[PDB]
Write a protein that binds this ligand. Structure first.
Ligand SMILES: O=C(Nc1noc2c1CCCC2)[C@@H]1CC12CCC2
Ligand code: NI
Length: 312
């Protein structure tokens, strides 16, 4: 009936956003442990779902090309003005990444060497609900398996949007849908394992203990430290997951997620030691170290190194 658009196939359905590849590289961002809902369905063409709509994204040297599938078998068209603002806000393009890259490089010789090769690594501004439950699935997991669990979770619980080729696209579920009495049993069948309990328990907790999704919007305007402590009350949400949500969904650019992986990197590349191994206190100290070094956009600087580390 319908299928994935390319820039060759249907150029009449594409809108451009003037964006250098030094400000944004899709292939270093869209599948680099931030979002798990983007796939390169055709080469250099990234498809995924953004707030009840499917997008396909490609780019040149100084143009980001995008096209929308609204579904409902309605009259197909280019992206609108409001839908391009949505994409502009999603990539946080108002913030200059080149200026940030140079600012971080000024105090960090290691970052400067890595920065050379890996440009346009920025932070996506994700939905809190989507981000929270995606990073509850992240514990003792890899990008490949997390991407599976999230896709299957959205198919099972989330509303259907459109089909392109053999790929059916579902929007992310609401909290009520994940809070049901059967929710955990289904999610174990979908292969989440122990993470199934934390998804249901956290969904039920935000509803009953915090009063629905308006709470997560309150944490967006709340100070970083208040937001982090609030999230750590949720089942299966510790310091690492709280910092991820803070950094990627609650506009806290100074949030530095710390697990064994960033510990390994911090030690090997910066020679950092707690002033022996991991610990709630030692992890907290490593986050402060990077904030002190890089400043109030420390989480954005981490994404560059993190995405750089995924590519050998
Ligand atoms: O940990 C993950 N992502 C991140 N943690 O810290 C940062 C990121 C992405 C960018 C900012 C810094 C995701 C869950 C995994 C485990 C392997 C993929
Ligand atoms: Ni050492």
């Amino acid at each position: 009936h319908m299928r994935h658009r390319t820039l060759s196939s249907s150029p009449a359905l594409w809108a451009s956003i003037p964006c250098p590849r030094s400000e944004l590289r899709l292939d270093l961002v869209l599948a680099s442990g931030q979002s798990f809902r983007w796939k390169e369905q055709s080469p250099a063409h990234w498809s995924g779902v953004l707030a009840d709509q499917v997008w396909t994204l490609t780019q040149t040297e100084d143009q980001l090309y995008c096209t929308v599938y609204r579904g409902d078998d309605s009259q197909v068209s280019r992206p609108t003005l409001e839908e391009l603002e949505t994409l502009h806000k999603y990539f946080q393009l108002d913030v200059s990444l080149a200026q940030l890259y140079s600012h971080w490089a000024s105090v960090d010789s290691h970052f400067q060497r890595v920065a050379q090769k890996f440009q346009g690594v920025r932070l996506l501004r994700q939905d809190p609900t989507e981000c929270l439950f995606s990073f509850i699935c992240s514990s003792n997991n890899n990008i490949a398996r997390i991407t599976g669990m999230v896709e299957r979770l959205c198919q099972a619980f989330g509303p259907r949007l459109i089909q392109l080729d053999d790929v059916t696209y579902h929007g992310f579920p609401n909290l009520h849908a994940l809070a049901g009495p059967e929710a955990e049993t289904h999610l174990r069948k979908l292969g989440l394992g122990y993470r199934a309990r934390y998804v249901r328990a956290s969904a039920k907790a935000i509803l009953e203990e915090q009063g629905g999704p308006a709470w997560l919007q309150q944490l967006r305007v709340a100070p970083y430290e208040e937001a982090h402590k609030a999230l750590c009350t949720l089942p299966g949400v510790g310091a690492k997951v709280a910092d991820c949500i803070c950094l990627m969904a609650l506009d806290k650019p100074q949030a530095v997620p710390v697990d064994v992986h960033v510990w390994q990197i911090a030690h090997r590349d910066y020679g950092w030691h707690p002033k022996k191994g991991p610990s709630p206190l030692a992890n907290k100290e490593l986050g402060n170290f990077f904030r002190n070094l890089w400043g109030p956009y420390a989480g954005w600087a981490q994404a560059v190194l993190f995405s750089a580390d995924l590519r050998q």
